[PDB]
UniProtKB/Swiss-Prot annotation, chain A:
The lineage of its organism: Eukaryota, Fungi, Dikarya, Ascomycota, Saccharomycotina. Gene3D superfamilies: 2.20.25.30. Its cofactor is Zn(2+). Present with 21800 molecules/cell in log phase SD medium. Pfam families: Ribosomal_L37e. Keywords: Cytoplasm, Metal-binding, Ribonucleoprotein, Ribosomal protein, RNA-binding, rRNA-binding, Zinc, Zinc-finger. It comes from Saccharomyces cerevisiae (strain ATCC 204508 / S288c) (Baker's yeast). This is Large ribosomal subunit protein eL37A.
From Swiss-Prot, chain B:
The eukaryote-specific C-terminal extension harbors a nuclear import signal and delivers the ACL4-uL4/RPL4 complex to the pre-ribosome, triggering uL4 release from ACL4 and incorporation into the 60S ribosomal subunit. Changing residue 46 to E: Leads to a slower growth at higher temperatures but allows RPL4 assembly into the 60S subunit. The modification Omega-N-methylarginine is found at residue 43. N-terminally acetylated by acetyltransferase NatA. Belongs to the universal ribosomal protein uL4 family. This is Large ribosomal subunit protein uL4A. Component of the ribosome, a large ribonucleoprotein complex responsible for the synthesis of proteins in the cell. The small ribosomal subunit (SSU) binds messenger RNAs (mRNAs) and translates the encoded message by selecting cognate aminoacyl-transfer RNA (tRNA) molecules. The large subunit (LSU) contains the ribosomal catalytic site termed the peptidyl transferase center (PTC), which catalyzes the formation of peptide bonds, thereby polymerizing the amino acids delivered by tRNAs into a polypeptide chain. It comes from Saccharomyces cerevisiae (strain ATCC 204508 / S288c) (Baker's yeast). It is found in: Cytoplasm; Nucleus. It comes from the Eukaryota. The chain holds residues 53 to 104 of 362 of the full protein. There are 2 genes for uL4 in yeast.
UniProtKB/Swiss-Prot annotation, chain C:
Residues 1-21 are annotated as: Disordered. Component of the large ribosomal subunit (LSU). Mature yeast ribosomes consist of a small (40S) and a large (60S) subunit. The 40S small subunit contains 1 molecule of ribosomal RNA (18S rRNA) and 33 different proteins (encoded by 57 genes). The large 60S subunit contains 3 rRNA molecules (25S, 5.8S and 5S rRNA) and 46 different proteins (encoded by 81 genes). eL39 interacts with YIH1. Coiled coil: none annotated. It holds the Pfam family Ribosomal_L39. The keyword Ribosomal protein applies. Its main location: cytoplasm. This is Large ribosomal subunit protein eL39. InterPro entries: Ribosomal_eL39, Ribosomal_eL39_CS, Ribosomal_eL39_dom_sf. It comes from Saccharomyces cerevisiae (strain ATCC 204508 / S288c) (Baker's yeast). Keywords: Cytoplasm, Ribonucleoprotein, Ribosomal protein. One of its GO terms (biological process) is cytoplasmic translation.
UniProtKB/Swiss-Prot annotation, chain E:
Component of the ribosome, a large ribonucleoprotein complex responsible for the synthesis of proteins in the cell. The small ribosomal subunit (SSU) binds messenger RNAs (mRNAs) and translates the encoded message by selecting cognate aminoacyl-transfer RNA (tRNA) molecules. The large subunit (LSU) contains the ribosomal catalytic site termed the peptidyl transferase center (PTC), which catalyzes the formation of peptide bonds, thereby polymerizing the amino acids delivered by tRNAs into a polypeptide chain. InterPro entries: Ribosomal_uL29, Ribosomal_uL29_CS, Ribosomal_uL29_euk, Ribosomal_uL29_sf. Belongs to the universal ribosomal protein uL29 family. The gene is RPL35A. Keywords: Cytoplasm, Phosphoprotein, Ribonucleoprotein, Ribosomal protein. It comes from Saccharomyces cerevisiae (strain ATCC 204508 / S288c) (Baker's yeast). There are 2 genes for uL29 in yeast. CDD domains: Ribosomal_L29_HIP. GO terms for cellular component: cytosol; cytosolic large ribosomal subunit; preribosome, large subunit precursor. This is Large ribosomal subunit protein uL29A. The keyword Zinc does not apply.
Length: 87, 52, 50, 126, 119
RNA sequence: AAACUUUCAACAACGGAUCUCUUGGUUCUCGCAUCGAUGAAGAACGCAGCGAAAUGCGAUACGUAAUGUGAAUUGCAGAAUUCCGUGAAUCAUCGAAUCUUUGAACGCACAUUGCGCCCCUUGGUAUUCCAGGGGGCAUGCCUGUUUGAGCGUCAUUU
RNA sequence: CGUGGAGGUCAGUGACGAAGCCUAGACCGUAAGGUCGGGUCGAACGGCCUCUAGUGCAGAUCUUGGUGGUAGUAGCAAAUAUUCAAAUGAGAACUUUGAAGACUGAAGUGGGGAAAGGUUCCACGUCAACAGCAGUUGGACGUGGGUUAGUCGAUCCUAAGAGAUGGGGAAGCUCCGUUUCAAAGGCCUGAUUUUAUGCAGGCCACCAUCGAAAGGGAAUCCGGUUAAGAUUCCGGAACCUGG
RNA sequence: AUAUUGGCGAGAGACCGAUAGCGAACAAGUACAGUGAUGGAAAGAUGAAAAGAACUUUGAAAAGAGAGUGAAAAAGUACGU
RNA sequence: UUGACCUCAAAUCAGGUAGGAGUACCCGCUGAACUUAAGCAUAUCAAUAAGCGGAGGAAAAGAAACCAACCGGGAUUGC
């Protein structure tokens, strides 16, 4: 029937490199994603199981603005300025 | 823990070639030479009497 | 071949710098216990396939 | 004493301010005392170490020799010796890693860095 | 070397303009000598000077906006900041308790008189 | 009278238990309320004199500015004199800026830094095309200024 | 009875060497064991009276890692063929150069593209692992360089196909259809160069987008140079479109 | 007042002590493999100071046999035991 | 052969609003299987697991068409 190939004559990229994330999981045909939701407002990130959750949360990356959080209101809505006092 | 050993659920082979019950971890030569969790087998100890 | 695109090729253009690990100075640094990195690859015989 | 709030009575949870200690305070960790003469002249014994000051070795393996503070280490918590230098394989300078706390200071350098600061750091200067 | 930062805040927008050009030619002359010698005499002190100039100039162009637009509820969306959403919404120090003739009897007209339970 | 095999007390390979430890990680109280259109999080494309791999950062790209501390760090190189007090500092602190191509991320798309228009300024001695820099525009509700159909209903002049 | 761990005590022991391992060294006990010496090693150790229960071990096709007998073993047969000389080297049946003898006989191991792959091509240097014999060569490793376009493509357009607004279900997350009751789009001219444009006639039914690297299609070939690659640079000879 | 497994700041403790505890104390949503949703590794330890090996003999290189350094070279880039 | 009020629209302006991630706990709506079973349905598991949306910084609920037959009772939730 096959002759021999099952993964033989393979030369057509199915899931292309996802521009949204980069996990390579999107096709032009069905126009749907399998990483974090592509053309739509959806986001493939659920909470089932004891795993596969933190990779869509926070704490494991950059958080360039979340560092500005734990910073400002440590005193009391500081949005003004300051100067010298004791050298 | 409610997630100690609660993170593995696969299926291995049966009759034929010489192979015991080890959840065939995907990828040939990935270090996980037939591992998982479950009870007192796969590389992941078990804890009798769940501490209430 | 070569012909593809940029956006796809851009994401695949970074392993060129992975061809240059430790010259003659990284071997002895500040409290370094990890010498060579285990992320090297040469696809002459290696089959990464992303 | 465990009574207030900011207090760690645990062994393992008392070395957090060592490996991740602020470099602005890591130098304070590498301080140096004085002697039995400058104690009744300055009052304060614990003083910040300085590159422009000398020191004498009492322990270690070089008794009767003095050293000069040059390059200091904070990641390894040590300091090289400018004066007392050994020989490598040809005869140059061996990075003798010591510490100013285990060494007795004999001479200093009276500037305005102290005196007035001593009044701020609690004391009565000279 | 290491330049200053107070010498740039005392100059006008014209003096800093010509000074910026002088730093432009400094870049092309501090990148050539690198393929030959392994280290350049002044390679570190080149990204600290220009970075300080652009900071002062941009600051002086924003403080002038707070001059003619001062004293109005309609200032351009660039004088304030990001802040948060809670302050822009929620209750206030007046809308939380609309002082009138009826609500006055709740807290203002009838508050809480002090007392000392003893004898 | 030897070599080899099994049982083999020391030395010398391959293989690399157990015990003695640590800057960290699972069950639980109290206190605090600091995410969210002046642009979040994650990922990709990157950055230092020898920077490939983290963190941080986003053509001011392992910083700048301000405050506090008050006289460095590194394996090596380079090194000005502000070094007895208009500010060293890879740590810490950090109210005011900046942040591309993607992304709850905006003219319209993405296997494609894809594909247009309007306004302002300079040159090609041309208000119309092209190029560079800066600044914008899309849909479903609830108010409002300047403005349009429809003899459904309802009025005023010879 | 032993091991791990907590509390109390002999205010114990502890570089005059703890604990752990080996010991064809000894004593006591019916059986579970402990102490001493030597060697190795150089940092906190042990007993009794209690408490705690994830402490002891030949097998559940038990889990993971490592090591033998077999064994200096089987195998090393698809595709006719090796040998001599020279250079280099400690070292050569096999890499380089030259010669002789041959295989494949454009339906081949040729010479040009697409897909996959993005530094595996070119230059220099090196031989510790891998490259199941050998191998100074190499698709192993380290240090560099090359990426130049109005024109052959792609982008633009269309069929198949995917997919909005204006409607029509559902609690939410959405699907199908592609014009199935339109108030969808705003231009030529007249009154207006210097008004960035307000009121009336006379017209046009097209009126989200994406969608082929073998098809569709106004435009450039040849020759030479370099360590590598052009129709791109240099030199010579021409044409078309828009403003 | 009452609730409070994720974020921030002390003791979170009569736990375990690297085949154990969560998947992760290290590069840790790691490496490798796959068209996708996933499963998910193996390896903790030098010394006060790398002084990480002067010089000489044999050898093409990597080594061994001396010597020097160190409390011990019975710690020699295969790391305390 | 001539001007107003109401309803129904159309922009790029001053001044506003909308589309989500994480998500312990809690709330509204919709909706399964396996275990046990003196056989099977009913029932238990279960106003559940998983998934989605909105609001809050605790949420839901709660200052009475409520709870009693007594000595009349004096808001909600939780141990």
């Amino acid at each position: 029937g096959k002759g021999t190939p099952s993964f033989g004559k393979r030369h057509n990229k199915s899931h292309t490199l996802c521009n949204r994330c980069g996990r390579r999981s999107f096709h032009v045909q069905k126009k749907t994603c399998s990483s974090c939701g592509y053309p739509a407002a959806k986001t493939r990130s659920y909470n089932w199981g004891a795993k596969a959750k933190r990779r869509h949360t926070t704490g494991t990356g950059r958080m360039r603005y979340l560092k500005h959080v734990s910073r400002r209101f440590k005193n009391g809505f500081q949005t003004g300025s300051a100067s010298k006092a004791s050298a | 823990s409610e997630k100690a050993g609660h993170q593995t659920s696969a299926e291995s082979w049966g009759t034929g070639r010489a192979v015991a019950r080890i959840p065939r971890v995907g990828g040939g030569g990935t270090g996980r030479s037939g591992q998982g969790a479950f009870g007192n087998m796969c590389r992941g100890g078990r804890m009798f009497a769940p501490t209430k | 071949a070569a012909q593809k695109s940029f956006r796809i090729k851009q994401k695949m253009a970074k392993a060129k710098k992975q061809n240059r690990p430790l010259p003659q100075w990284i071997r002895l640094r500040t409290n370094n216990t990890i010498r060579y990195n285990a992320k090297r690859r040469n696809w002459r015989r290696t089959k990464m396939n992303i | 004493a465990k009574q207030s709030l900011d207090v760690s009575s645990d062994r393992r949870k008392a070395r957090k301010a060592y490996f991740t200690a602020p470099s602005s305070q890591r130098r304070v960790l590498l301080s140096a005392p004085l002697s039995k003469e400058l104690r009744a002249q300055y009052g304060i014994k614990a003083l910040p170490i300085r590159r422009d000051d000398e020191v004498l070795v009492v322990r270690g393996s070089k008794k009767g020799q003095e050293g000069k503070i040059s390059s200091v280490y904070r990641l390894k918590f040590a300091v090289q010796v400018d004066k007392v230098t050994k020989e490598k394989v040809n005869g140059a300078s061996v990075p003798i890693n010591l510490h100013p706390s285990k060494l007795v200071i004999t001479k200093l350098h009276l500037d305005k860095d102290r005196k007035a600061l001593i009044q701020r750091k609690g004391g009565k200067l000279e | 070397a290491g330049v200053k930062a107070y010498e740039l805040r005392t100059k006008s927008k014209e003096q800093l303009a010509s000074q910026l050009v002088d730093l432009k030619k400094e870049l092309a002359e501090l990148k050539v000598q690198k393929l030959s010698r392994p280290s350049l005499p002044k390679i570190k002190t080149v990204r600290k000077s220009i970075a300080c100039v652009l900071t002062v100039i941009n600051e002086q162009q924003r403080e002038a906006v707070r001059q003619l637009y001062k004293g109005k509820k309609y200032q351009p969306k660039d004088l304030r900041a990001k802040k948060t959403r809670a302050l822009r919404r929620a209750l206030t120090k007046f809308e939380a308790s609309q002082v009138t003739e009826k609500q006055r009897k709740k807290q203002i007209a009838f508050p809480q008189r002090k007392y000392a339970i003893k004898a």
